[PDB]
Design an enzyme around this catalytic site. Structure first.
Site, PDB file in Angstrom:
ATOM      1  N   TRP A 220       0.839  -1.202   0.000  1.00 22.95           N
ATOM      2  CA  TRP A 220       0.000   0.000   0.000  1.00 22.95           C
ATOM      3  C   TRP A 220       0.876   1.255   0.000  1.00 22.95           C
ATOM      4  CZ3 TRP A 220      -4.410   1.447  -1.430  1.00 22.95           C
ATOM      5  CH2 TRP A 220      -4.787   2.766  -1.206  1.00 22.95           C
TER       6      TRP A 220
ATOM      7  N   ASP B 224       6.809   5.857  -8.073  1.00 24.47           N
ATOM      8  CA  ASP B 224       7.958   5.931  -8.950  1.00 24.47           C
ATOM      9  C   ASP B 224       9.178   5.218  -8.360  1.00 24.47           C
ATOM     10  OD1 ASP B 224       8.946   7.842  -7.152  1.00 24.47           O
ATOM     11  OD2 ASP B 224       8.533   9.522  -8.481  1.00 24.47           O
TER      12      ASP B 224
ATOM     13  N   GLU C 237       9.760   6.161  -4.860  1.00 23.24           N
ATOM     14  CA  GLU C 237       8.762   5.810  -3.882  1.00 23.24           C
ATOM     15  C   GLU C 237       7.806   6.946  -3.622  1.00 23.24           C
ATOM     16  OE1 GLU C 237      10.225   2.985  -0.950  1.00 23.24           O
ATOM     17  OE2 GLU C 237      11.202   1.925  -2.605  1.00 23.24           O
TER      18      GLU C 237
ATOM     19  N   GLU D  50      25.041   6.978  -1.688  1.00 23.85           N
ATOM     20  CA  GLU D  50      23.855   7.198  -2.495  1.00 23.85           C
ATOM     21  C   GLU D  50      23.874   8.556  -3.194  1.00 23.85           C
ATOM     22  OE1 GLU D  50      20.320   8.596  -0.392  1.00 23.85           O
ATOM     23  OE2 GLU D  50      19.416   6.646  -0.846  1.00 23.85           O
TER      24      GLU D  50
END
Length: 371
Positions: free
Chosen positions: A117, A167, A170, A327
């Protein structure tokens, strides 16, 4: 276009990239996203893992990449019944909620690591199909090893490719994201054009659906000659070059490819470091290694070797003292006031991010620079 100083450093970062990916690969074959980052520790993503696996496959570690594909295949075969039930629901006119869909995060033992969800995404299944086919072709491997898992992913994607979902980042569950559609397209074309898979029952359907994806992107995913972030938007996203290489919506020399690379560069690339999207507030919206690598890969494929190298050099400059790639880095922030609260809540930025290393390996390989 590199001197001995640069070559030595880039070769070392390649070796280190291989080492840190394979050292952290789980015993069962999954690649973790970020073993030391609180929010991600214990979880694997098919997106991160598939690009990681492609870097490793290019590097030539057939064993490691194959163990990842084994892991994914087994996880997917375990979802055969869930997928069959979703398809049966659709056939009864009872379309499943996002809450019933296949997951985004996996635990290393193949269970849901998160509730769809809150993070329903279809891109990773498309990426996995692209990755496994590409690996098998590169190394002359029999896809029957992974076929039953491929069948689960194909059946799932043929049913659900056109559904709104979050996407790659998230976000925005109500929209249909061009790099998600692109990832699905890349996977479908990979299986639909693979000779070893010519007799699969879904063979023709995969290419027909890929064509339907391209129709949708042509109708709603191109503005001013460039791809856009989601259908019906005007903005770009740093993931969009993936729709060119590797996912193949258009050739590298297509005008839409050129215009998309130029729009991403203009709107999102600061000094070689590529932002995700203008409104990005995650850690203040920093510069993502994987996106600089993706753009560099795309520039290389289009013949812009110098542009590719500039992005490779930028990435190398973000390695820490151990060679680890984060990242993202904060040299330029889109929304600097938003950074502190992410750092307070989740800690310092994920490093190493395995996907960063995987993308580095891909770009290095594209430039002929693996040691």
């Amino acid at each position: 276009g590199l001197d001995s100083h640069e070559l030595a450093r880039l070769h070392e970062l390649a070796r280190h990239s291989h080492a840190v990916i394979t050292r952290h690969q789980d015993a069962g074959g999954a690649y973790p996203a970020a073993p030391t980052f609180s929010a991600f520790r214990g979880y694997a993503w098919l997106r991160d893992g598939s690009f990681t696996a492609e870097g490793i496959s290019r590097y030539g570690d057939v064993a490691s990449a194959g163990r990842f594909h084994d892991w994914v295949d087994g996880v997917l075969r375990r979802r055969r019944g869930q997928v069959d039930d979703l398809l049966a629901a659709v056939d009864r006119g009872e379309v499943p909620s996002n809450e019933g869909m296949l997951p985004t995060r996996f635990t290393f033992d193949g269970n849901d690591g998160s509730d769809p969800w809150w993070d329903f995404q279809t891109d990773g299944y498309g990426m996995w199909l692209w990755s496994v086919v590409t690996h098998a072709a590169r190394h002359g491997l029999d896809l029957e090893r992974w076929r039953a898992g491929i069948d689960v992913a194909v059946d799932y994607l043929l049913a659900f490719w056109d559904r709104p979902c979050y996407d790659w980042w998230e976000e925005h569950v109500e929209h249909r994201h061009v790099s998600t559609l692109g990832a699905i397209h890349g996977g479908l074309v990979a299986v639909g054009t693979c000779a070893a898979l010519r007799s699969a029952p879904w063979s023709a359907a995969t290419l027909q659906v890929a064509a339907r994806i391209r129709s949708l992107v042509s109708a709603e995913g191109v503005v001013d000659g460039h791809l856009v972030k989601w259908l019906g938007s005007s903005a770009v996203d740093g993931s969009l070059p993936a729709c060119v290489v590797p996912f193949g919506l258009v050739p590298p020399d297509d005008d839409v490819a050129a215009m998309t690379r130029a729009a991403v560069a203009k709107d999102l690339d600061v000094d070689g470091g590529v932002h995700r999207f203008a409104a990005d507030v995650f850690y203040g919206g920093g510069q993502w290694i994987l996106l600089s690598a993706l753009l560099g890969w795309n520039l290389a494929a289009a013949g812009d070797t110098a542009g590719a190298l500039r992005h490779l050099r930028w990435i190398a400059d973000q390695a820490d003292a151990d060679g680890d790639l984060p990242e993202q880095v904060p040299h330029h922030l889109l929304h600097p006031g938003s950074r502190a609260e992410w750092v307070a809540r989740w800690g310092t930025v994920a490093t190493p991010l395995l996907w960063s290393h995987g993308m580095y390996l891909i770009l290095a390989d594209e430039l002929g620079l693996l040691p």
